[model samples]
Target: DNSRYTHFLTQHYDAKPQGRDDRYCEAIMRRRGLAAPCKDINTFIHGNKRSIKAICENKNGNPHRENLRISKSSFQVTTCKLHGGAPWPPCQYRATAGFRNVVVACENGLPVHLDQSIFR
Candidate 1:
């Protein structure tokens, strides 16, 4: 869970899609200890029952009232489309970023599963 949140913050939410180059994936993979050619990297936010309320009342001045609906919540997934010829020390990746709505299942304030659709 913590790792997911960290990935979200580092690779998606706070990341600037523009100006990113091959070094981006290389650095992230190295820091995370992930193997080379990291592919299809994806992550989603799991919100608890009170998540909407918390976000709506967020003191950091984030999203506005119009964007607080559950449907507006989504996942930020980053996938590696290309890996430079070198697979080890100098592995490179072209990342593709996208967003998709997901349904989260939680227990005791922790996420159990992130369903791709509203249905089970």
Candidate 2:
């Protein structure tokens, strides 16, 4: 297994909502160890973990590319963009929440990277 994207995958897939975008972004990125040095683009899908996992596990998920999986159903998510600041320790983010069908990278039966979750 390429395990290269495992950390980003685990950090990106967050099931619970932390109320607001700014708070959510700061909290998640900091704890996940993505804040330091800054992360430009990151998204948090807000849905049941099992459902998200099934995007790769269930028969519904289709092949988008060689290693990527795509879902027909849309899921709720919050996208965070790094704010205008220095790329130093600690991070700032602006977020928007919406729903979209997800595209991801799957290994065997597990989702390892949430590459795309855009509205369609």
Candidate 3:
């Protein structure tokens, strides 16, 4: 679902090195196997208003918005941490290969709306 975020970016904001946007959008489409967000970013941006309210549930049956951890609408490069512990985990996980914007919404601290941004 995050990949759909690419379309949202291309449509709403101007991008540099055009191919970069296309590649990102296509990659996300491939990864999630979902249709691209509405061709127009503005439409895609507001199109899913209904889906936002859909309650996300945890196994514990808690219905708090905070439970959702959505990404913000910024292009800050972030790293994935793999800590070694009882079972041991891998370190140096994949960083997002390129740049994009992100936006997030939350009701009970759970992220609801998702968006990407290029601005720091």
Worst 10 residues of 3 by lDDT: 38-47
For TM-score, the strongest prediction is 2
Show model 1 residue runs off by greater than 4 Å. 1-21, 36-72, 81-88, 102-107, 112-120
- Candidate 3's TM-score reads 0.26
Q: What tens-digit string does per-residue lDDT give for candidate 2 at 9-51? A: 5667777676747888877877778888787768877777777
The numbered model that scores best in lDDT is 2
Off by over 4 Å in 3: 1-21, 36-74, 77-102, 115-120
Error of 1 at 31 (Å): 1.0
Candidate 3 per-residue lDDT, tens place, 1-120, comes to 554445433343232323333444444333432323211111112223223222222311233244333332323222122223322211212223333333454445333344333222
Total clashes for model 1: 0
lDDT of 1: 0.41
lDDT (tens digit, per residue) of candidate 1 on 1-120:
455544333332323334334565556655655544443342323224434223323221143233322334544444443354554555456755555553333333333433333321
What is the TM-score of candidate 2? 0.81
RMSD of each: 8.7, 2.9, 15.7
Among residues 3 or more apart in sequence or in different chains, the pairs in candidate 1 whose N, CA or C atoms overlap within 3 Å are none
